[PDB]
Symmetry: D2
Subunit: 256 residues, 4 copies
């Protein structure tokens, strides 16, 4: 409501209306924050601008940011500095892997396919954290989105699971680095949600019914449940929480 | 100020101003919640009553509830059902072990001691949950406090460590049971905090100092940081969070 | 092979020819070990003495030992000390919980059933390790059997899951106490196996069918696979392994 | 003495007498296995050939295999195929990261340093498995060596910790892919041992003294304890174990 009043956050990864990052943006805005959006490339610019503009308030800054490109990533955060000077956090909702690796056997993943997944889905957290460390002059929280596949084997998640494991270990090492700089680093492990990228995981419809049937809360997750947990982590209420991975998956993670 | 407005919660475990339960009480109260307190035996009625009255708004119910007593436990929740219509959660901050067993080697723990710690520090959660369920129509969240010692070996924690491990598994199984009924069950794993029961844990000062020197946030936690994470878990913001264990310990849990 | 020549181990838990403890006995025997068997009640002395005799040229010591009875427990190892003097390990394969509690919801577990399960399935490892220590003057290993349900929520496991969590934490703390005396403590988390006690777990056939179809090895575990892993753990090949939990479940534990 | 008789294993990562892979080689040899060795580059050809010759009996195949190079990888395994035909396993003991990244803040790791560690220390396992799979027509085990730094934050391990988390997740996805082909994939999480590349880790003597004082067994690990646990994983005694990470660290991993 006013939980994030006066704070400005950088949300990375909105692609369209179903993006979990969009769910995060709406929750942060409703909690009173100001936002900055970064999108992967020119193709997405229109979607993010129009989405950003549905939010009441000042025209939000929308900037291209291919996290695979160091010069653009660095220039993006320099622009952010010149524009607002200080931000209070970054929501990192980025991941990618060649579609053909998310099927069949993980053992057939090509080297380039594996490094690509690692580069975009795990390293980008660290590269982003490094630039955000510069503008988060008042400390704050850095968030990332992970998935159960990084902790245990999920069918067809393959190289993405290995990349998330690496992302989750990154959260821990970054939390270890940044805490003394007043910066908390956390992850949200969301349960399956229908998004543009969900199309790369096989038989999604049946995965969702499995969640509805077996998850403790008997229902699938929503972008809003994730965004609201994100509000907590970016807010002062989470002051003592860092290097933590919170599962917003209707409790599915406890099932053996 | 309004996050918990219109909600009523039971805070079990207040012994004095330093109790973690009290920090939770204050946080819930500052978030607009109505509180009902439960104390162990008569010796603690005066203390709790006093602290409760120090809050404002309508006076708070203060009921005796010794978790080793099934009758007094069922009576307490009977009173609550009659006095208040519904509650939206319970904050379980109860634990006990004989100081004798918290010294030296765990292999020397008596069957009596081991069963006593299990009964009070772990089973109580379930006992409380079965009663809470009766007055928790509309749903809500059940919270309990645990410690790292239930996940790994912490010097001197011994039998309490094994108790917390049960508590922690109990959280998972209860979450699995109660989710269909709209009830979430989560735990907060707090870092060392200076409390009455902190005397059983030998050489606390060295403990607080190692945390300040090695924890990512370079500070020990407080009853308020825990209180604030509880506000989150009892709120609708934590809608899809259940069967989780959130470490409010300055990030110490990630260290190896 | 001949890994255990001249070593003597106590196998507690044989009840059946299908008992996992018996699978361990046979493997220990084939690796050249001398065994001492203990059985719950007179009701089982017949089967154990009978099975124990089927081993080639052997002393075949078989003593009674109800782990809930401190007198018997103490007399059993006193007898062992008098007749053998020094043993090199103990296989703790004991567990129990009222069948009622293995049904329906965990929240309805009664206080006595919960403590019954903890006393028999978890504390006994400690009570046994305490006596065993007196007779393991050359170091050695203490093994116990746990199951996945102690780490994550497995349906129809309820109170056993929580007793197993205490058991697994007990392993860690005992390992921590005993390592300095040259004594290692480890667990084997076995996958579902048709034993007498497995009849207490609902719809076992489908449980086995699921392991067969989804476990990495596409087959269910056998008492022999567990036995052979016990051989490694009691042998010197595992002298650097303590406080560990080895899943002998065709890799099922890794599945998310 | 003949646990691995008739079996042939490929050991990757011998650099010198103090390498953990050399400890594994002696252990596998003592148990009767035949060995094929691979070295990183010309520089090590000598050292490895000399150590191999020491394993009297049969002139062991010693081949170059830079895991960074696709052709060498293919060349090495096609040679084993044409030369030996069938192997029963591979011991993967390879890791690398720039020294500068193993100090200071992990957040400062460069994209290249990060992808380099991932490539050599994590992907290499998969590339090796893809090739080994072609010559393990009879099944068998693939082993890798990880470290606590991949599960939890270990000071200065930084990027290697993230690489190891990635390696550990890979062990699981590979176990899940190769199990149906009769191939098990496992890891040994070795405790700190004085090796050639251990010089890259912070004050090693104080690290070792810490383990000697805190570790359950009150002693540091050796290449032999690792080698003996490797013997088990490659033997038929471990046929039911896959996707597992056995800690051969004197029990240190259990400490909180
Ligand atoms: N949808 C789910 O069920 C689910 C569950 C758990 C975790 N996640 C994670 O949440 C995040 C967001 O995923 P989503 O499900 O909303 O899908 P999405 O397709 O909406 O978002 C993925 C985002 O990554 C961006 N991206 C890819 N390469 C990029 C690059 N090189 N530079 C900058 N951005 C790049 C895409 O533009 C997109 O905005 C991902 O990390 C994903 O793994 C999703
Ligand atoms: N203080 C810390 O450092 C710390 C850290 C992590 C977790 N915890 C946990 O938080 C909870 C609260 O502990 P605390 O540190 O505030 O100590 P505390 O001594 O203030 O509170 C413990 C409470 O348990 C109550 N209790 C004991 N036996 C009871 C019984 N039979 N019936 C009902 N209530 C009973 C006591 O009255 C007391 O109010 C405990 O579970 C504890 O293990 C504490
Ligand atoms: N069968 C499986 O699928 C499976 C899987 C994982 C773990 N386990 C564990 O392995 C152990 C052996 O179980 P099992 O499956 O061979 O079944 P089982 O029924 O053959 O053996 C259980 C043993 O516990 C003994 N026991 C019960 N109460 C006792 C008491 N008061 N004092 C002494 N002994 C007592 C019984 O006599 C019996 O010998 C148990 O801890 C069990 O939880 C079994
Ligand atoms: N020494 C320890 O305390 C310890 C603890 C836990 C895990 N480990 C792991 O054990 C493995 C062996 O390490 P070690 O301690 O024996 O050190 P080491 O220096 O003897 O071995 C490291 C090996 O990696 C090889 N290597 C590097 N780049 C390579 C490449 N491109 N292609 C092929 N091989 C390459 C090196 O030649 C060397 O043989 C590593 O994975 C290491 O992380 C070591
Ligand atoms: O991580 C995810 C988990 C689930 Cl269940 C669904 C979608 C996910 O997100 C992705 C999956 C594959 C690729 Cl290539 C990119 C992204 Cl963002
Ligand atoms: O769990 C705790 C953890 C820490 Cl570090 C300090 C105090 C704790 O709380 C207790 C410790 C011992 C007993 Cl007998 C009862 C309680 Cl409530
Ligand atoms: O732990 C077990 C796990 C599985 Cl899958 C099957 C049997 C098991 O063993 C038991 C189950 C229930 C009770 Cl009451 C006692 C025992 Cl020994
Ligand atoms: O993983 C390790 C863990 C420890 Cl305690 C000691 C040495 C280790 O091994 C390495 C460390 C750094 C680099 Cl660059 C390469 C290797 Cl093989």
């Amino acid at each position: 409501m006013e939980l994030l009043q006066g704070k400005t956050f950088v949300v990375m990864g909105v692609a369209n209306q179903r993006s979990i990052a969009w769910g995060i943006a709406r929750s942060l805005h409703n909690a009173g924050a100001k936002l900055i959006f970064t999108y992967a490339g020119e193709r997405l610019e229109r979607n993010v601008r129009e989405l950003a503009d549905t939010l009441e308030g000042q025209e939000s800054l929308v900037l291209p940011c291919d996290v695979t490109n160091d010069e653009e990533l660095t220039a993006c955060f320099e622009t952010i500095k010149q524009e607002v000077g200080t931000i209070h956090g970054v929501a990192h909702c980025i991941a990618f892997a060649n579609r053909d690796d998310l099927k069949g056997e993980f053992v057939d993943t090509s080297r380039d396919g594996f490094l690509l997944a690692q580069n975009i889905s795990a390293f980008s957290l660290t590269a982003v954290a490094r630039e955000a460390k510069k503008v988060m002059t008042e400390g704050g929280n850095i968030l990332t989105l992970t998935y159960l596949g990084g902790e245990r084997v999920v069918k067809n998640y393959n190289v993405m699971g290995v990349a998330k494991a690496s992302l989750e270990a990154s959260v821990k090492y970054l939390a270890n680095d940044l805490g003394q700089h007043g910066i908390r680093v956390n992850a949200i492990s969301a349960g399956p949600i229908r998004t543009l990228s969900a199309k790369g995981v096989g038989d999604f419809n049946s995965i969702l019914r499995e969640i509805e049937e077996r998850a403790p809360l008997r229902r699938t997750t929503t972008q809003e449940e994730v965004g609201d947990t994100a509000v907590f982590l970016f807010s002062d209420l989470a002051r003592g929480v860092t290097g933590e991975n919170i599962h917003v998956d209707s409790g599915y993670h406890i099932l053996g």
